[PDB]
PDB file of C-alpha atoms in Angstrom:
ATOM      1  CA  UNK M 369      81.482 -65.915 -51.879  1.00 47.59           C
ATOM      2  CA  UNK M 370      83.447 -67.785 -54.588  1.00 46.29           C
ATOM      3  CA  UNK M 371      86.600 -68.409 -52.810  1.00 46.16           C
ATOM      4  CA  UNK M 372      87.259 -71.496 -50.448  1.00 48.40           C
ATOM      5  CA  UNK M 373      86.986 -72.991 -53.956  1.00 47.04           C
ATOM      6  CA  UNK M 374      89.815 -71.485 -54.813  1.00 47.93           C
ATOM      7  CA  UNK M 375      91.838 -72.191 -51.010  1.00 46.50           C
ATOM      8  CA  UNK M 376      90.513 -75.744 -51.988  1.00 47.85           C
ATOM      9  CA  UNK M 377      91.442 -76.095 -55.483  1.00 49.35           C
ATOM     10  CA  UNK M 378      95.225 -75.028 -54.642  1.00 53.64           C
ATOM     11  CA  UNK M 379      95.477 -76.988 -51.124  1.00 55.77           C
ATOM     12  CA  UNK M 380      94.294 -80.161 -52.514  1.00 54.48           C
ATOM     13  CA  UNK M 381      94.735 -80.874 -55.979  1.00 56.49           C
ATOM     14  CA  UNK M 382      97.794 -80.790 -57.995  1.00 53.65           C
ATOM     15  CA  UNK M 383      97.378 -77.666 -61.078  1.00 54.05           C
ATOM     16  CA  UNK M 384      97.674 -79.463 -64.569  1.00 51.14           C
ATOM     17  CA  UNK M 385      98.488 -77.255 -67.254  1.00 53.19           C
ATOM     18  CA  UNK M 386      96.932 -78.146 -70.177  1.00 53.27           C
ATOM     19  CA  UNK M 387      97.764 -77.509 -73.491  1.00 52.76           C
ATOM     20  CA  UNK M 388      95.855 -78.708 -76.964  1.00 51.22           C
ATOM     21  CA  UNK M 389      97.477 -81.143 -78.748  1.00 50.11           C
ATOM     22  CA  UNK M 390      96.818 -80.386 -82.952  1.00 50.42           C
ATOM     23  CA  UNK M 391      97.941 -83.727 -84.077  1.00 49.46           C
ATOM     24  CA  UNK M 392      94.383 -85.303 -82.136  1.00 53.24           C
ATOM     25  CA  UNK M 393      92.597 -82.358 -83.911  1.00 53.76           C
ATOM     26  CA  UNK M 394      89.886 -83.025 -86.149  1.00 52.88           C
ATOM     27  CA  UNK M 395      90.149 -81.149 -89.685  1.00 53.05           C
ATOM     28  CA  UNK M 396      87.328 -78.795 -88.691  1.00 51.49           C
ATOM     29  CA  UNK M 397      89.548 -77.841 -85.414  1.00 51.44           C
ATOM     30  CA  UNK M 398      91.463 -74.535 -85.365  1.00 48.22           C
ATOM     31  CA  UNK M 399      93.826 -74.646 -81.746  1.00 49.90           C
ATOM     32  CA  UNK M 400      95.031 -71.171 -81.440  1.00 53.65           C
ATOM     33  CA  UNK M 401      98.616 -69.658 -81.690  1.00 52.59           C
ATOM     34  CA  UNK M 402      99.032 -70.198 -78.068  1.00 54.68           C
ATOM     35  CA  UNK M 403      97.336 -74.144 -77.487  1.00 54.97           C
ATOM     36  CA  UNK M 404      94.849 -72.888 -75.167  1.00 58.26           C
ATOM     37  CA  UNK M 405      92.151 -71.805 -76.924  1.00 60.93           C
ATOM     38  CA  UNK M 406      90.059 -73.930 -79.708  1.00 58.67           C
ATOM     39  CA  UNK M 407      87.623 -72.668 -82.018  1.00 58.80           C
ATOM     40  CA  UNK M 408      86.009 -74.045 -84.989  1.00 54.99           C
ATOM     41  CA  UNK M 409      86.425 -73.779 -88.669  1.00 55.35           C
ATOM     42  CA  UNK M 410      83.830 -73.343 -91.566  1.00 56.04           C
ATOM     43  CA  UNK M 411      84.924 -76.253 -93.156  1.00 60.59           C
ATOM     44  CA  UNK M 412      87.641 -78.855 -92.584  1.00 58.16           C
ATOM     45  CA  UNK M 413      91.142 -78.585 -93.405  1.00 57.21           C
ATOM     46  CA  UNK M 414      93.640 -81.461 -95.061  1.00 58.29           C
ATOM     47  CA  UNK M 415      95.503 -82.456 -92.386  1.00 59.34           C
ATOM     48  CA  UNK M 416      98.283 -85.132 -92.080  1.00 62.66           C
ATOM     49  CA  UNK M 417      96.780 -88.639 -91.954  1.00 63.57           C
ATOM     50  CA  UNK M 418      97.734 -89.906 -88.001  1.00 63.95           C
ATOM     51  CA  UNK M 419      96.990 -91.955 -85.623  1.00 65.58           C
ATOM     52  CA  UNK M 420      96.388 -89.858 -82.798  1.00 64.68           C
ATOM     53  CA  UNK M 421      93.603 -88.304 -84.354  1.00 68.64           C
ATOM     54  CA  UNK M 422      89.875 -87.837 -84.179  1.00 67.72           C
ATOM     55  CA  UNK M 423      88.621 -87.930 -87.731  1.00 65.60           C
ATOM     56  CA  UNK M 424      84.874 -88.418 -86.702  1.00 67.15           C
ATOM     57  CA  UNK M 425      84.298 -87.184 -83.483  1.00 67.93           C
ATOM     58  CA  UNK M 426      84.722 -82.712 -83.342  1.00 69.79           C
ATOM     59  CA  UNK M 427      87.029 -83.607 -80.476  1.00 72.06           C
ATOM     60  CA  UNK M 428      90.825 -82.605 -79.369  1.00 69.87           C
ATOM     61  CA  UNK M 429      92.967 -83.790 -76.628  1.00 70.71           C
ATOM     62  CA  UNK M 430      95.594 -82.380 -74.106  1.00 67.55           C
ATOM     63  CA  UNK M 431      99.595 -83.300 -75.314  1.00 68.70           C
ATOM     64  CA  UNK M 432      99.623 -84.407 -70.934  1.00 64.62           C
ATOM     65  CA  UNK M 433      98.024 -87.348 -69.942  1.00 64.01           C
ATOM     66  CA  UNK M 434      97.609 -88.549 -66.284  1.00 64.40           C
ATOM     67  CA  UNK M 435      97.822 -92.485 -64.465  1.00 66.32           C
ATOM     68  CA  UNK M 436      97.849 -91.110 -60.872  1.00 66.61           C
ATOM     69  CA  UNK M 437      97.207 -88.058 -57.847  1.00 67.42           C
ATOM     70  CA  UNK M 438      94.916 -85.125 -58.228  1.00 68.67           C
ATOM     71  CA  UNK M 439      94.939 -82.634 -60.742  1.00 70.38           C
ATOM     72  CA  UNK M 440      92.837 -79.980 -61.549  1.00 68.51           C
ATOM     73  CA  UNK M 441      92.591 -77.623 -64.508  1.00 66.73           C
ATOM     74  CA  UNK M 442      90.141 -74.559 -65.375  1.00 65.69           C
ATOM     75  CA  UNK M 443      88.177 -73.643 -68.460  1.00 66.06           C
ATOM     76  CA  UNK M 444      86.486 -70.393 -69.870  1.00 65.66           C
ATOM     77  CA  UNK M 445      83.526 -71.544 -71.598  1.00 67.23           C
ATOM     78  CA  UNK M 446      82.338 -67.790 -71.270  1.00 67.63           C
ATOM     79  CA  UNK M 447      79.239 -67.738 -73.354  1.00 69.01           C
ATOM     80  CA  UNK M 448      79.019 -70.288 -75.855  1.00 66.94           C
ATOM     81  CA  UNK M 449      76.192 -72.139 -76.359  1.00 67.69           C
ATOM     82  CA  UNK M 450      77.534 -75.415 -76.802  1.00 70.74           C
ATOM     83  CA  UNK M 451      80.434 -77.439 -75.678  1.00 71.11           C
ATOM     84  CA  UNK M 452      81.294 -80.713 -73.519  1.00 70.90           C
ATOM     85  CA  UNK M 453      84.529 -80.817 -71.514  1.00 68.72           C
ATOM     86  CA  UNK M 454      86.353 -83.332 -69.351  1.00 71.19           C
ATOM     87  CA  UNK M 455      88.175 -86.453 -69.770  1.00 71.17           C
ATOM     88  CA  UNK M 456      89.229 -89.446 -71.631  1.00 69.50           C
ATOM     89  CA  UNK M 457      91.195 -92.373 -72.547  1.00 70.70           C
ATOM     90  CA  UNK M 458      94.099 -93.373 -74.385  1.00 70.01           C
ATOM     91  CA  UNK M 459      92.260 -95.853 -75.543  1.00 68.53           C
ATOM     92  CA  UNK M 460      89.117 -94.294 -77.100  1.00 72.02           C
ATOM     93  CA  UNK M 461      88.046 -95.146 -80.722  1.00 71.65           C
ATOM     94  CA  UNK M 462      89.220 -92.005 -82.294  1.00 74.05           C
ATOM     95  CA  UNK M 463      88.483 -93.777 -85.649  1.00 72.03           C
ATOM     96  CA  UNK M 464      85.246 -95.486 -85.894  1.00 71.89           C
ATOM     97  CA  UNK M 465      81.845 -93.785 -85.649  1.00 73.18           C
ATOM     98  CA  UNK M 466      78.778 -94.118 -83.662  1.00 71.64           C
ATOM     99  CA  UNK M 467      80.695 -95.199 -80.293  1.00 69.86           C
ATOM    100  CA  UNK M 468      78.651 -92.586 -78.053  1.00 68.92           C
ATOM    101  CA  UNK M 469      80.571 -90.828 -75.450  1.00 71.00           C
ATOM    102  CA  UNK M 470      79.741 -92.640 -72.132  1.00 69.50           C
ATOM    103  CA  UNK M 471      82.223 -93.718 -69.485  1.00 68.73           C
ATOM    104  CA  UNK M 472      81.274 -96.962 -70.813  1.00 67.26           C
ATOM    105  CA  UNK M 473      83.476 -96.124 -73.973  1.00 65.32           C
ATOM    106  CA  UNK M 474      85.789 -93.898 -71.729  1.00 66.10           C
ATOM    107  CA  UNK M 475      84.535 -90.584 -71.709  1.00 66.24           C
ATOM    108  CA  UNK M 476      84.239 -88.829 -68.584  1.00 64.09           C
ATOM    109  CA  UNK M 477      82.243 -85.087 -69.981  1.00 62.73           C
ATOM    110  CA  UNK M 478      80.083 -82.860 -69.530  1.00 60.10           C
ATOM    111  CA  UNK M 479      78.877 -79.858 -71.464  1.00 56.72           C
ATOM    112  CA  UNK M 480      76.035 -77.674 -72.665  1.00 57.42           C
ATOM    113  CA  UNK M 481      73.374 -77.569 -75.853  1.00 56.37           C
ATOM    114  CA  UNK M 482      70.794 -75.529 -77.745  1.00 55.80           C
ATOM    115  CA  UNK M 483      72.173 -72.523 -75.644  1.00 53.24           C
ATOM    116  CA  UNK M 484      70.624 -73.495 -71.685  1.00 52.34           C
ATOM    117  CA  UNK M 485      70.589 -77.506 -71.704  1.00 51.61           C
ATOM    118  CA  UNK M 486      73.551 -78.588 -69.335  1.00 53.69           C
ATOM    119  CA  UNK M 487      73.898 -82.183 -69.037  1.00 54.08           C
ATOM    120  CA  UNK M 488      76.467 -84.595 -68.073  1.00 50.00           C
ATOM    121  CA  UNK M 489      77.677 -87.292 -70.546  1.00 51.12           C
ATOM    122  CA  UNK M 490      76.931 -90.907 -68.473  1.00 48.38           C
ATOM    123  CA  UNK M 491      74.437 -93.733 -69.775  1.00 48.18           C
ATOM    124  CA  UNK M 492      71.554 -92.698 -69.725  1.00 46.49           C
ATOM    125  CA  UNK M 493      72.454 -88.638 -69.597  1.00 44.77           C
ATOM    126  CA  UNK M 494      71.733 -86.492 -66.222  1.00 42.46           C
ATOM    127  CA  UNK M 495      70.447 -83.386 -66.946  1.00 41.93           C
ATOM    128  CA  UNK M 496      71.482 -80.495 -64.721  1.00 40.47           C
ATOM    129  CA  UNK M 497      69.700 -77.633 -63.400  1.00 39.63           C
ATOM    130  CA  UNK M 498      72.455 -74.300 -62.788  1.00 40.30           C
ATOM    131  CA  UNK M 499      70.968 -71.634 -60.725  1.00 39.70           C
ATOM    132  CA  UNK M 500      73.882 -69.745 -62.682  1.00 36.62           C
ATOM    133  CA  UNK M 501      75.392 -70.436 -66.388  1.00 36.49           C
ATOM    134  CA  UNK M 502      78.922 -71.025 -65.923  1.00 37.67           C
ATOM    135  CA  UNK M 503      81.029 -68.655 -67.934  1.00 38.89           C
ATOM    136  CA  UNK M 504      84.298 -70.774 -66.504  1.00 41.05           C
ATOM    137  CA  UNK M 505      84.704 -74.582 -65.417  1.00 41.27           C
ATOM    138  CA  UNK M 506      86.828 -76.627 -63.203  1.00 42.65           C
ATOM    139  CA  UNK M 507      87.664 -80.060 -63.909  1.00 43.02           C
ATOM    140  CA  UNK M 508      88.721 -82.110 -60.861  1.00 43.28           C
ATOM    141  CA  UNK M 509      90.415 -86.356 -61.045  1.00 43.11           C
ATOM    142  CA  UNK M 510      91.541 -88.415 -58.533  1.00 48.06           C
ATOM    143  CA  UNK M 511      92.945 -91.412 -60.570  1.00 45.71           C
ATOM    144  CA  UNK M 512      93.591 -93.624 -57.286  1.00 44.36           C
ATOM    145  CA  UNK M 513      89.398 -92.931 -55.845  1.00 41.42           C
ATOM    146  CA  UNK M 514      88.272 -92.850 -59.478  1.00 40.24           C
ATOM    147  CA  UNK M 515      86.161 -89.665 -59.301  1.00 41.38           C
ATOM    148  CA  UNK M 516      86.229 -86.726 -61.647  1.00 40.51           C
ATOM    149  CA  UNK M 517      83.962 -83.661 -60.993  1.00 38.55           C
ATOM    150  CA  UNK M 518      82.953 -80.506 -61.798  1.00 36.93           C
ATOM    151  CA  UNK M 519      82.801 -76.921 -60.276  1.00 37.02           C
ATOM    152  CA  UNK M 520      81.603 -73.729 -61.501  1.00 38.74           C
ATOM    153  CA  UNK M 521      84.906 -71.831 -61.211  1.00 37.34           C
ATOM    154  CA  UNK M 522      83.150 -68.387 -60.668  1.00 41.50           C
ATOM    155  CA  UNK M 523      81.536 -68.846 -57.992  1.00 40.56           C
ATOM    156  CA  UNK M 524      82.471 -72.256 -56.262  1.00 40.88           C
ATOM    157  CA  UNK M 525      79.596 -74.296 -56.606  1.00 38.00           C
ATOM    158  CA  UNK M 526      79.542 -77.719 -57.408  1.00 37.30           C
ATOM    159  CA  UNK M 527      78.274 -79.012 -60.750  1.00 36.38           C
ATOM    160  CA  UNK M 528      78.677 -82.856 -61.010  1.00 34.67           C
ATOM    161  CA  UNK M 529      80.497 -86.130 -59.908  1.00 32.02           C
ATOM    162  CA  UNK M 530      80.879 -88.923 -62.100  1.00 34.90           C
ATOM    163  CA  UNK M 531      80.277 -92.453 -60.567  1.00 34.44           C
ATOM    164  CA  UNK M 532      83.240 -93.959 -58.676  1.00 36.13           C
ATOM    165  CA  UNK M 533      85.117 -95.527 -61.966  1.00 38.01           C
ATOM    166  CA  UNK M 534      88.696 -98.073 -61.243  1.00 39.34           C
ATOM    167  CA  UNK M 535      90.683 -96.564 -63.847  1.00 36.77           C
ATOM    168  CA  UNK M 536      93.150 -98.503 -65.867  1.00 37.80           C
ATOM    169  CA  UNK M 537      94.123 -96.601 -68.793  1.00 35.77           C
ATOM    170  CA  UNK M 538      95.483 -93.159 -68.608  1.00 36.27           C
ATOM    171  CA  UNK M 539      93.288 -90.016 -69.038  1.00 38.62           C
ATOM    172  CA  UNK M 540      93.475 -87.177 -71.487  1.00 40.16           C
ATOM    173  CA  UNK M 541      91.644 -84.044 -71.265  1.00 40.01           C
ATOM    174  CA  UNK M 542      89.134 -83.754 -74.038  1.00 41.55           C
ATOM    175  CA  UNK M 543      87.332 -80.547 -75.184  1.00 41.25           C
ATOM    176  CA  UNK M 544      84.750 -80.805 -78.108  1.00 41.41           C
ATOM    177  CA  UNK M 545      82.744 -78.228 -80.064  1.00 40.29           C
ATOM    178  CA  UNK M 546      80.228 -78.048 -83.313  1.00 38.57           C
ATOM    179  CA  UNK M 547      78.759 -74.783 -83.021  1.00 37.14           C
ATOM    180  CA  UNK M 548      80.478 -72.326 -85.167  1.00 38.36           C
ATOM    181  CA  UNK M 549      80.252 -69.039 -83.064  1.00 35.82           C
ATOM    182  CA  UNK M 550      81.832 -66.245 -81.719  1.00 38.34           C
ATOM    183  CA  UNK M 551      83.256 -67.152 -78.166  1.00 36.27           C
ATOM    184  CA  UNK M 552      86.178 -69.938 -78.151  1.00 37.21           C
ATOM    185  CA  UNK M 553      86.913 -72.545 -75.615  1.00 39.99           C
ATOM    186  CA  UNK M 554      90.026 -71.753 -73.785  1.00 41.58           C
ATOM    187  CA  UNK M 555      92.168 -73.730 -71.476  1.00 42.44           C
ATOM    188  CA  UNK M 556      92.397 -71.286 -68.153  1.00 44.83           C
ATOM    189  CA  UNK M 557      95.985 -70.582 -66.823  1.00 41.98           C
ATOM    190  CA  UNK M 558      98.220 -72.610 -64.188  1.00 43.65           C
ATOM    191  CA  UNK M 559      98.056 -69.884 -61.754  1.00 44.31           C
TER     192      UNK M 559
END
Protein backbone atom coordinates (compact mmCIF):
# COMPACT_ATOMS: atom_id res chain seq x y z
CA UNK A 1 0.00 0.00 0.00
CA UNK A 2 2.28 2.85 1.16
CA UNK A 3 4.83 0.96 3.01
CA UNK A 4 8.01 -0.69 1.37
CA UNK A 5 8.60 3.08 1.08
CA UNK A 6 8.90 3.28 4.38
CA UNK A 7 11.13 -0.44 4.83
CA UNK A 8 13.11 1.45 2.04
CA UNK A 9 13.47 4.82 3.34
CA UNK A 10 14.89 3.39 6.82
CA UNK A 11 17.08 0.40 5.22
CA UNK A 12 18.78 2.59 2.83
CA UNK A 13 19.15 6.07 3.53
CA UNK A 14 20.58 7.70 6.49
CA UNK A 15 17.40 10.01 8.50
CA UNK A 16 18.57 13.77 8.51
CA UNK A 17 16.89 15.78 10.94
CA UNK A 18 16.34 18.97 9.81
CA UNK A 19 15.86 21.95 11.53
CA UNK A 20 15.28 25.78 10.07
CA UNK A 21 17.94 27.91 10.44
CA UNK A 22 16.40 31.87 11.21
CA UNK A 23 19.60 33.61 10.55
CA UNK A 24 19.09 32.45 6.39
CA UNK A 25 15.45 33.67 6.91
CA UNK A 26 14.14 36.26 4.82
CA UNK A 27 12.30 39.23 6.80
CA UNK A 28 8.91 38.01 5.57
CA UNK A 29 9.85 34.40 7.20
CA UNK A 30 8.28 33.40 10.54
CA UNK A 31 10.20 29.69 11.63
CA UNK A 32 8.12 28.48 14.43
CA UNK A 33 8.92 28.01 18.22
CA UNK A 34 10.08 24.59 17.50
CA UNK A 35 12.37 25.10 13.85
CA UNK A 36 10.23 22.81 12.02
CA UNK A 37 7.58 24.53 10.79
CA UNK A 38 7.73 27.93 8.52
CA UNK A 39 5.01 30.12 7.72
CA UNK A 40 4.80 33.47 6.29
CA UNK A 41 4.34 36.93 7.55
CA UNK A 42 2.12 39.90 6.29
CA UNK A 43 4.89 41.99 5.94
CA UNK A 44 8.63 41.76 6.61
CA UNK A 45 10.31 42.15 9.78
CA UNK A 46 13.85 44.16 10.60
CA UNK A 47 16.07 41.61 11.01
CA UNK A 48 19.87 41.65 11.76
CA UNK A 49 21.86 42.48 8.61
CA UNK A 50 23.96 38.84 7.86
CA UNK A 51 25.50 37.08 5.64
CA UNK A 52 23.83 33.93 5.69
CA UNK A 53 20.77 35.36 4.60
CA UNK A 54 18.28 35.45 1.78
CA UNK A 55 17.17 39.04 1.46
CA UNK A 56 15.55 38.53 -2.07
CA UNK A 57 14.65 35.19 -2.55
CA UNK A 58 11.29 33.99 0.19
CA UNK A 59 13.72 31.18 0.98
CA UNK A 60 15.23 29.50 4.37
CA UNK A 61 17.78 26.91 4.89
CA UNK A 62 18.48 23.88 7.26
CA UNK A 63 21.35 24.86 10.27
CA UNK A 64 22.84 20.87 8.76
CA UNK A 65 24.43 20.74 5.66
CA UNK A 66 25.65 17.52 3.89
CA UNK A 67 29.19 16.63 1.55
CA UNK A 68 28.57 12.84 1.55
CA UNK A 69 26.14 9.27 2.05
CA UNK A 70 22.40 9.20 1.85
CA UNK A 71 20.07 11.06 3.76
CA UNK A 72 16.61 11.45 3.66
CA UNK A 73 14.17 13.80 5.36
CA UNK A 74 10.18 14.18 5.21
CA UNK A 75 7.90 17.16 4.77
CA UNK A 76 4.12 17.95 5.45
CA UNK A 77 3.12 20.18 2.79
CA UNK A 78 -0.55 19.12 3.79
CA UNK A 79 -2.64 21.44 1.74
CA UNK A 80 -1.04 24.46 0.71
CA UNK A 81 -1.23 25.66 -2.49
CA UNK A 82 2.13 26.70 -3.08
CA UNK A 83 5.58 25.79 -2.06
CA UNK A 84 9.00 24.36 -3.59
CA UNK A 85 11.21 22.12 -1.44
CA UNK A 86 14.57 20.42 -1.78
CA UNK A 87 18.09 21.35 -1.90
CA UNK A 88 20.86 23.74 -2.27
CA UNK A 89 24.24 25.09 -2.07
CA UNK A 90 26.47 26.81 0.14
CA UNK A 91 27.27 28.69 -2.46
CA UNK A 92 24.00 30.15 -3.84
CA UNK A 93 23.60 33.96 -4.40
CA UNK A 94 21.52 34.65 -1.41
CA UNK A 95 22.09 38.37 -2.26
CA UNK A 96 21.58 39.33 -5.77
CA UNK A 97 18.29 39.04 -7.66
CA UNK A 98 17.06 37.50 -10.76
CA UNK A 99 19.48 34.29 -10.50
CA UNK A 100 16.49 31.73 -11.22
CA UNK A 101 16.51 28.61 -9.25
CA UNK A 102 17.94 25.90 -11.61
CA UNK A 103 20.58 23.33 -10.74
CA UNK A 104 22.49 25.46 -12.99
CA UNK A 105 22.66 28.10 -10.08
CA UNK A 106 22.48 25.19 -7.46
CA UNK A 107 19.08 24.54 -6.69
CA UNK A 108 17.91 21.14 -6.64
CA UNK A 109 13.55 21.84 -5.94
CA UNK A 110 10.57 21.11 -6.58
CA UNK A 111 7.20 22.41 -5.53
CA UNK A 112 3.64 23.36 -6.40
CA UNK A 113 1.61 26.69 -7.83
CA UNK A 114 -1.77 28.31 -8.42
CA UNK A 115 -3.13 25.45 -6.12
CA UNK A 116 -2.71 22.00 -8.74
CA UNK A 117 0.51 22.94 -10.94
CA UNK A 118 3.40 20.59 -9.62
CA UNK A 119 6.54 21.09 -11.35
CA UNK A 120 10.09 20.45 -10.78
CA UNK A 121 12.64 23.34 -10.73
CA UNK A 122 15.41 22.24 -13.73
CA UNK A 123 16.09 24.39 -17.02
CA UNK A 124 13.61 24.40 -18.81
CA UNK A 125 10.86 23.26 -15.91
CA UNK A 126 9.16 19.57 -16.04
CA UNK A 127 5.81 19.69 -15.25
CA UNK A 128 4.36 16.77 -13.32
CA UNK A 129 1.20 15.01 -13.49
CA UNK A 130 0.16 13.38 -9.57
CA UNK A 131 -2.57 10.92 -9.78
CA UNK A 132 -2.69 12.09 -5.97
CA UNK A 133 -1.75 15.69 -4.33
CA UNK A 134 0.81 15.02 -1.88
CA UNK A 135 -0.16 16.22 1.55
CA UNK A 136 3.62 14.99 2.75
CA UNK A 137 7.07 14.77 0.79
CA UNK A 138 10.23 12.88 0.94
CA UNK A 139 13.40 14.27 -0.09
CA UNK A 140 16.06 11.68 -0.99
CA UNK A 141 20.44 12.66 -1.88
CA UNK A 142 23.08 10.58 -2.61
CA UNK A 143 26.04 13.10 -2.66
CA UNK A 144 28.64 10.36 -4.03
CA UNK A 145 25.86 9.23 -7.37
CA UNK A 146 24.67 12.84 -7.47
CA UNK A 147 20.91 12.15 -7.50
CA UNK A 148 18.26 13.74 -5.35
CA UNK A 149 14.57 12.64 -5.67
CA UNK A 150 11.33 12.79 -4.61
CA UNK A 151 8.55 10.52 -3.12
CA UNK A 152 5.12 11.09 -2.10
CA UNK A 153 5.52 10.05 1.55
CA UNK A 154 1.80 8.91 1.88
CA UNK A 155 1.59 6.58 -0.25
CA UNK A 156 5.12 5.60 -1.70
CA UNK A 157 5.07 6.68 -5.08
CA UNK A 158 7.70 8.25 -6.81
CA UNK A 159 7.58 11.91 -7.83
CA UNK A 160 10.89 13.00 -9.53
CA UNK A 161 14.72 12.50 -10.06
CA UNK A 162 16.91 15.22 -10.80
CA UNK A 163 19.62 14.60 -13.53
CA UNK A 164 22.79 12.82 -12.34
CA UNK A 165 24.70 16.18 -10.96
CA UNK A 166 28.90 15.70 -9.59
CA UNK A 167 28.48 17.68 -6.60
CA UNK A 168 31.20 19.83 -5.22
CA UNK A 169 29.83 22.13 -2.78
CA UNK A 170 27.85 21.03 0.16
CA UNK A 171 24.00 20.95 0.17
CA UNK A 172 21.48 22.65 2.38
CA UNK A 173 17.93 21.90 2.54
CA UNK A 174 15.89 24.77 1.24
CA UNK A 175 12.11 25.33 1.76
CA UNK A 176 10.46 28.48 0.14
CA UNK A 177 6.96 29.98 0.32
CA UNK A 178 4.95 33.34 -0.94
CA UNK A 179 1.50 32.46 -0.43
CA UNK A 180 0.22 33.80 2.76
CA UNK A 181 -2.29 31.04 3.91
CA UNK A 182 -3.47 28.94 6.43
CA UNK A 183 -1.45 25.56 6.34
CA UNK A 184 2.48 25.89 7.20
CA UNK A 185 5.35 23.96 5.85
CA UNK A 186 6.73 21.70 8.42
CA UNK A 187 9.86 19.70 8.60
CA UNK A 188 8.46 15.90 9.41
CA UNK A 189 10.12 14.09 12.43
CA UNK A 190 13.39 11.78 12.59
CA UNK A 191 11.41 8.82 13.42
Amino acid sequence: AGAAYHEWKMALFKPADVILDPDTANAILLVSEDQRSVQRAEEPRDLPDNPERFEWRYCVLGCENFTSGRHYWEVEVGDRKEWHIGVCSKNVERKKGWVKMTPENGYWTMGLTDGNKYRALTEPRTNLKLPEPPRKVGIFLDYETGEISFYNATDGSHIYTFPHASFSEPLYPVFRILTLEPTALTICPIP
